[PDB]
Amino acid sequence: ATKAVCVLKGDGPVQGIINFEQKESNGPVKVWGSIKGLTEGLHGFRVQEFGDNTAGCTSAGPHFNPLSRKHGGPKDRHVGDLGNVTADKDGVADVSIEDSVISLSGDHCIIGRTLVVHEKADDLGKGESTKTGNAGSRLACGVIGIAQ
Template sequence: MAGKAGGLKGVALIGGGGGNSTVAGALHFFQDPSTGYTEVRGRVTGLAPGLHGFHIHSFGDTTNGCNSTGPHFNPHNKSHGAPSDDERHVGDLGNIVANKDGVADIFIKDLQISLSGPHSILGRAVVVHADSDDLGRVFQSFLRFGSSTLSVTSSKVIIIRQVSLDFDLQFNNLYSIVMKLEVVVVCCSEIWKSLALFVPDFLKNGS
């Protein structure tokens, strides 16, 4: 994402990631200094119809597609959420919707992304994901994961066995370190990052 001199403006050109060369688009960012809101306007084409996660990622390095852009931009160490949530990554911009022709017209107003200051998004990456964003709802109140390594062949996680963890904790603050579960997160249909989750010993044999 590059900035434009003389004002709080930015532009991001979207290209295909994960071997997908059909996705293209241009996004324009404008921050209103009187309100603090940043507007995102633009169009992305070449998408599959439906919802697609839309985020600012930490690094502007696209040399290896989405794999080199890092995680969602999260300078305040918050949990993943929806754009309207108080508890969210700065880079959490929710989903965009592609029509039957694979075209997504985008208009977003957001108070957390900024084009200036210590947490500016200028120089970072804008990522359109192959699949929809769950907006952090999967990990709220009840966490359901298998008690063995999860198998991932696409961006949809296959749960081998399920246990219900009756915790209401932040996703990143699980502390009962007994049994390790590996979860592979997929970005742009490629393996992006591994996360470690833990469950208490008494739930090892749950179903």
């Protein structure tokens, strides 16, 4: 099985570790971990095209969107649209997602790209909505790396 990991870091309190696992190339990717330092409530969660962090999250580039589609929800979407995570009253968000569109191999591979958590909720393109989901600024991010 292929595994990956990402350390999310920002310019404030926001930080997290997110794990990825995919049993088969054609199968779903399991995404799990936690993010702290967040405002209570919903936060956009997505993969950007580039794993360029030379300017923090500002350099992560466009949304990961190989098929040139409109922004949407994970169940609708760009390959990078992973929906929302929810933070509790202590600012801690549990991440537990199973997604069949991202991958750890092939054209939808996200290894080497940037994972980002956003300031606001991603409207899933149901609101700029069909672009960035109106999720606001990038709070923290990291490059997705190969793991064991």
